[PDB]
Amino acid sequence: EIMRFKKSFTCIDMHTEGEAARIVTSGLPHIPGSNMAEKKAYLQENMDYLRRGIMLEPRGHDDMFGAFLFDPIEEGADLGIVFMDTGGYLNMCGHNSIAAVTAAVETGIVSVPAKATNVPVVLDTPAGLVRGTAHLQSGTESEVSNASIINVPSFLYQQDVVVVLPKPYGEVRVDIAFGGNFFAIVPAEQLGIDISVQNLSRLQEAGELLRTEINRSVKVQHPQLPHINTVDCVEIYGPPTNPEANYKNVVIFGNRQADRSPCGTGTSAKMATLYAKGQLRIGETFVYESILGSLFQGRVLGEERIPGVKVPVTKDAEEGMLVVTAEITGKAFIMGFNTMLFDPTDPFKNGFTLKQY
Amino acid sequence: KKSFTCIDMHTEGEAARIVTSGLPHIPGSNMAEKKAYLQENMDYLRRGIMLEPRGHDDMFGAFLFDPIEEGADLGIVFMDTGGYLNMCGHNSIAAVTAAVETGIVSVPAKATNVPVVLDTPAGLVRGTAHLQSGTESEVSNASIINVPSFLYQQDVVVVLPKPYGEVRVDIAFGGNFFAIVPAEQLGIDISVQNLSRLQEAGELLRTEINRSVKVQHPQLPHINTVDCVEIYGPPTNPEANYKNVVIFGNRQADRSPCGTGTSAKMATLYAKGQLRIGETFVYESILGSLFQGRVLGEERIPGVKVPVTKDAEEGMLVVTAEITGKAFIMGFNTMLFDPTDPFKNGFTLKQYIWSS
Ligand SMILES: *[C@H](C(=O)O)[C@@H]1CCCC1=O
Ligand SMILES: *[C@H](C(=O)O)[C@@H]1CCCC1=O
């Protein structure tokens, strides 16, 4: 029995509008690193089989997502966190950050002061500090109605980038923007495919293509964060189905996996792009719809121009790059408490996938 | 604010989410009625536990109940993402295993084998947990004696659209109905890379089959369609006799060798004199896992026949087949359902692919 639970992990399984967040709360040994990005590096280089065992079949599946919690390192942070999926490790994730804020408060990782209606929860992520706020349900001790995250600085990186793709797509114009991860943002109409669950496979294909061509043709580099230097996601957007939504989108990333949520980092990136182009005013509410009909809300809270520091879109005529502080709001639920087990003789203790390449 | 406890298992990669507590009270005077009740009035329980976000498109599981049938230790109803089912070889092995490892049935002092009898919608499934050398209750592997199995109809030729054309299958029962077909007949080599193609070929073949042949379980009217296609070929593992993948539901492949598929395969071979009683048959999966099997005996059912029963036989030939495999516990889970959670009953993004 003592030997059964050797190398086990404990998780709070959650979801944010259908998208998994497997939040691993214990089981890791000490992981060397002086910051969250280094701990993530250590995991990827030395312990990547853990991610595979926790994320993939049979304990997960090809669209599972999660995170390891750590003690916070940065000043003012409550919780350290490293995100993972079926392909690798993202520097940030909006839906998991929303889930983490929700879990922190619902399970007592962070104390709720008496008679409080909002509880802050600051996450120390590999992308930087993410300031969360849990909004409590009126008349409960610590039930969370929904959660806000103030993202790391977001920005438009390169505008009107043409990408050459095989038929039936061809030339597609995209923007490249940072919202925690680098996205390539492309309207669906430029792919010939409208956004629906029926067309998902065509979309997943279209966005694995587009993303490879991008990382071939276009070098990106976060100007304040050396370690962030590829386009991890493709955000395909179109007209809203929901009347409350400005737009619908699906984000394709990793092993051509599709995000079920409206995507928080993606929403930050979209809003930074709209804002840079004068199509969104500061404080205005922006609503993004998912493929499942769920909504995230967002607003741009502040702008800054960073002197002497430039990205491709920054004009010759301008001093510094424009960045924005974007808030994203959504709702997460606890769906289970799990103790995941790994028998040394389990031939699938490190998981498996039947997905091609 | 509902709450279920589960022992999450897998049998050589194939899920078995065994629900041990928290289910509502479900009527029925036998296990088939209990399953009928579940499917007509409580399908939301299955959907919540099997589908995303708590499960996924290839999740599989079972609800434990008090046994009803005399001699049984556990009542059980199986299910997957497509519906509730009557029998499941891999989940039976997992259930036997969990039953002994978590102390649902007793271990006699100094025993090396523990019987666990399951009361399923398809009848009694007599299982045995084989214990590891000197442990309180660590399970080495488990055997199940399937419900009676048989060849049903033989060398059925099937004209499929190209590139397939002519393919010959046998049809057999192992707790579920199967169409057994050589991979070679389809022109596809069995591998992970070819899974998509094998899943299509399974659908196409299955369709033409149910179109061109009606089938009937001559002891129960209702069980009357071929849902599963067992595609087999040369083994990769030298211990194995053959390799196979079972295609079922909606372009779903079984990750395990498939217990009921294995029983059906053995009934087939036996009827063709290709397998002896007591001989050990080893069947490999697409992931390289093995189940072992042995025909324990045969029987004739006087009066009763099926298309293969030759004129003069008086009764169809059935066999009793035993299947053995290993299941692992991969989690102790407590599944939660907020009444305000819009996905409390889960969702799937998987489409039925259809033309016109
Ligand atoms: C969505 C999000 O940030 O919520 C992103 C797209 C893929 C996973 C993500 O981090
Ligand atoms: C395999 C088995 O009996 O283990 C069956 C084929 C389809 C689903 C099953 O359970």
Numbering used by the authors:
A (entry chain A): 38 to 394
B (entry chain B): 43 to 398
Publication text:
Proline racemase of Trypanosoma cruzi (TcPRAC) is an enzyme present at all stages of the parasite life cycle, contributing to immune escape and persistence of the parasite in the host. Gene over-expression increases virulence, while knockdown appears lethal for T. cruzi. The structure also showed that TcPRAC crystallizes as a homodimer and bears a catalytic site on each subunit.
Compound 6 (NG-P27), bearing a five-membered ring (reminiscent of proline) was the most active derivative. The NG-P27 compound was co-crystallized with TcPRAC in the same conditions as the BrOxoPA complex. Continuous electron density was observed from residues 38–394 in chain A and 43 to 398 in chain B. Difference Fourier electron density maps indicate the presence of the inhibitor NG-P27 covalently bound to Cys300 in the active site of both polypeptide chains in the dimer. Electron density maps suggested possible multiple conformations of the cyclopentanone moiety of the inhibitor, but no attempt was made to refine alternative conformers and we describe here a single conformation of the ligand that best fits the electron density. The C2 atom of NG-P27 is covalently linked to the sulfur Sγ atom of the catalytic Cys300. In both monomers the inhibitor is very tightly packed, making numerous van der Waals contacts in the active site, and a hydrogen-bonding network stabilizes the carboxylate moiety of NG-P27 as observed for the TcPRAC/BrOxoPA complex. NG-P27, with prochiral substituents on C3, can form a second stereocenter. According to the crystallographic data, the 2S,3R configuration prevailed. Hence, the inhibitor, with C2 positioned si-face adjacent to Cys300, allowed nucleophilic addition (S) through to a mesomeric enolate intermediate. The apparent exponential kinetics constant (kobs) varied linearly with the concentration of OxoPA and NG-P27 as expected for an irreversible inhibition mechanism (inset). These results indicate that NG-P27 is a significantly more potent inhibitor than OxoPA.
